């Protein structure tokens, strides 16, 4: 038994192991969301300002494509643990790769440093993210009611790291010491790796030491050829385009846009066409399709807060916080701390609003629509602000007010989507359903990479009013089918 080899207490009433992973995840998410806060500015800032001097649209496009690929990599990375290394092996190798990625940015390699960094982080975060989360769940026995609260505590390290890292790294942006800030994230991640290596054999026992579905002798040959050939085709395409001098980021953004739109269709077609899924379970897979649209329209506007909304506020607002007499210069990296702070403060509040009601609470469709409609209205607000003022430098309060409207929308969509990924899931397609919920983010981010190109032709202000209305009109159309969708 997996439980007969591990401690069942030791961390706020949960297995001692939950304590180890909280510290490992805190330091990984801290270095990830910290590095992410500085990268956008590191890319488009001038050479004299220690930046890379990349086109505003290209730097904006790289962020959305980087993000998409991190979430897409969880699909083959959950496969490698399930079929080759086990969850422990993939977590460890993934962590070692992430460290190399942060170190790449600390070195003066400019573009070679940026692209090699991205490549190390994309691979590592696909091997580490879905498998570290798997071990948390595996620390609890079959008939153990604590597991739900264990994940609430586990995802607290996620928002703690995301909240603290941009506050700390704001000084490294101010003094233009980018390499120093990326080095801080690299060392920050090393503390995670050390804490795992020091305290993991005793707290996590034999849980995740071997794959669940190991590959047989023939499967090692079969998959080895397919993966080997696909890798070989990619290597040549990038090398031939490079030396001819025709290689650009459009090749990356277009390939990812194809994957972003193709992957959801493939999973839904596989699940629907399956002979294992019952007619009752098939109606739930059909009912999750309009929820996926609502989830994509949400994560599209929400993830633009990391590359579009923060640059808007930096360039068009006064960047001066002003609440009831208290005034201070607002840092550009501190826009990344709004969401995690509002999740930490108001997550248990919204969790109790639904508990107070019980049977009288709204459906998954009403909840998804409220979240998407708010995200849409967040873009109407900031778009109208700019339309009203124009050339007049408005307050940073209008930008912060936009971030708040979106996180209030997330507090309705994130806990609903987590329950939807497991409840609506068929018996034989539980992992395949976890993929369709996480692909709402990977697809939105893959769309964004190309959607940022429409900022220059339409205009920065007009871009906000259009995206806001596109999200609202489509959310209201799906809302007319609220009694039909609830099956
Ligand atoms: N759980 C992490 C978040 O939702 C915060 C993302 C952000 O920093 O914008």
Residue numbers in the entry: 9 to 495
From the paper:
We successfully captured PepTSh in complex with 5-aminolevulinic acid and determined two structures at 2.5-Å and 2.8-Å resolution, respectively. PepTSh adopts an almost identical inward open state observed previously, with an rmsd of 0.305 Å over 480 Cα atoms compared with the valacyclovir structure. The 5-aminolevulinic acid molecule sits in a similar position as the l-valine scaffold in valacyclovir, adopting a vertical orientation. Finally, during refinement it became clear that an unusual interaction could be observed within the binding site, wherein an arginine on TM1 (R37) and lysine on TM4 (K137) interact through a shared hydrogen bond. Of particular interest was the observation that 5-aminolevulinic acid adopted a vertical orientation as opposed to the horizontal one adopted by dipeptides in PepTSt.
Recently we discovered a prokaryotic homolog of PepT1 from the bacterium Staphylococcus hominis, PepTSh, which was able to transport a natural thioalcohol-conjugated peptide, exhibiting structural characteristics similar to prodrug molecules. POT family transporters belong to the major facilitator superfamily (MFS) of secondary active transporters, and use the proton electrochemical gradient to drive the concentrative uptake of di- and tripeptides into the cell.
